[PDB]
Amino acid sequence: TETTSFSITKFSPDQQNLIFQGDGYTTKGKLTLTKAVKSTVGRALYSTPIHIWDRDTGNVANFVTSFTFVIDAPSSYNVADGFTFFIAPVDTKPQTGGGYLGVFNSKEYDKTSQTVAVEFDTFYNAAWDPSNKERHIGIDVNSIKSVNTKSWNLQNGERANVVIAFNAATNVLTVTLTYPN
Amino acid sequence: TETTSFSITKFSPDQQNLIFQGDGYTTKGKLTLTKAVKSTVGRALYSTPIHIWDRDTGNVANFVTSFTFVIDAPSSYNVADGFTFFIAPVDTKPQTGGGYLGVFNSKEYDKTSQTVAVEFDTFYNAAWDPSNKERHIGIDVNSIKSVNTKSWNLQNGERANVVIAFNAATNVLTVTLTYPN
Amino acid sequence: VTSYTLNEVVPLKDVVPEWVRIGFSATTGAEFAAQEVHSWSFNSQLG
Amino acid sequence: VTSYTLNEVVPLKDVVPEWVRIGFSATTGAEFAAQEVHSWSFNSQLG
Ligand SMILES: OC[C@H]1O[C@H](O)[C@H](O)[C@@H](O)[C@@H]1O
Ligand SMILES: OC[C@H]1O[C@H](O)[C@H](O)[C@@H](O)[C@@H]1O
């Protein structure tokens, strides 16, 4: 049995329990990943390794996370590029930017990736994103091409409440997003 | 608000969330710090930095820990040297061995130390340990000389249950040790 | 209140290593925006 | 069941830095023993 848990409701100026990559930093008690600038990547990882399953017992972990974020666009027809919560190998570093959202490099399933990402995609990349050209929540495994999606209507500037849960008896990963209004 | 919590009831062979120093290692689901050998030090730290107080709010954290350990001596008149649970600066490294228990270097209060240690001392070091020559639980701050002690009777080989709690409104740190029988 | 739910079967034991880090990612390109987390909490239980 | 309790006032804000690691220590010398942790759990709440 090993359990683990945390909660930060306000970020310090030196969050020493976080790893920042690319343009991530803390200001005003928020964790900011990209400012509204052209062509930049922002990543922040929790530093303790999480033990998600076991060679010896073959067990997998149940888990849940919940967070709050806003995306703040100059308007609603200039909005790029997205935001991801992901689970990755311990030495993870930022991958390819722009529509690849910092965590992947192709739409072709790459087993070496070892990354599960949940995404909140704000921009259609014609080459892999749903043909309906809508903003969407997606689950991706080892590829920038979601294995499943839901179209969601960005409320530019509002605070979204997300909960992600994974159940280890059922192998089901679920995502729900809530807007206040 | 930032909270943090964990529980390991059985140790893996690669506890990746632990830092081992000196002779510490995991075997058989236990964390072993010193084997019964002459002159050796064993330290194991939880790797996430714990945020124990705040410049900006001036708050201090409440906290509690609980663990289980045994000391296993060849007999009861050859028992050395002790065991400590401590709170230290993040880059902590093992200090002086033997009766200094790996965490200190004098009995003279050293402010640079920044270490609070609770100890389970099994051997009288005439120079600082209670003149009654008894085995004892002690609270030490910045020195190998406990600012306060309790004499306890080592039950060589039994499993002790310890709980340590600190209350931030009262600045009181408490220790209780339980033997089964 | 406007909610959206998605779910799928992912077989975690086979995609990812026994030990993982968790975190957040964002990017801009030609177009852009500011993305920001205001709070984060997590719990898992293995075994 | 044999219990022992000790307590004291420590003023943590003044002894230790805002950020700390926690852990366990043991040593032997001339004489010795084996010291071993069989389970460990921790919780703190700041703020
Ligand atoms: O900012 C939106 C888009 O800008 C650039 O074309 C990048 O190549 C692309 O990946 C990104 O999705
Ligand atoms: O093993 C017990 C004792 O052995 C050696 O004399 C060490 O110098 C001393 O610090 C230790 O306490």
Ligand SMILES: [Ca+2]
């Ligand atoms: Ca995209």
Ligand SMILES: [Ca+2]
């Ligand atoms: Ca001693």
Ligand SMILES: [Mn+2]
């Ligand atoms: Mn997409």
Ligand SMILES: [Mn+2]
């Ligand atoms: Mn002592």
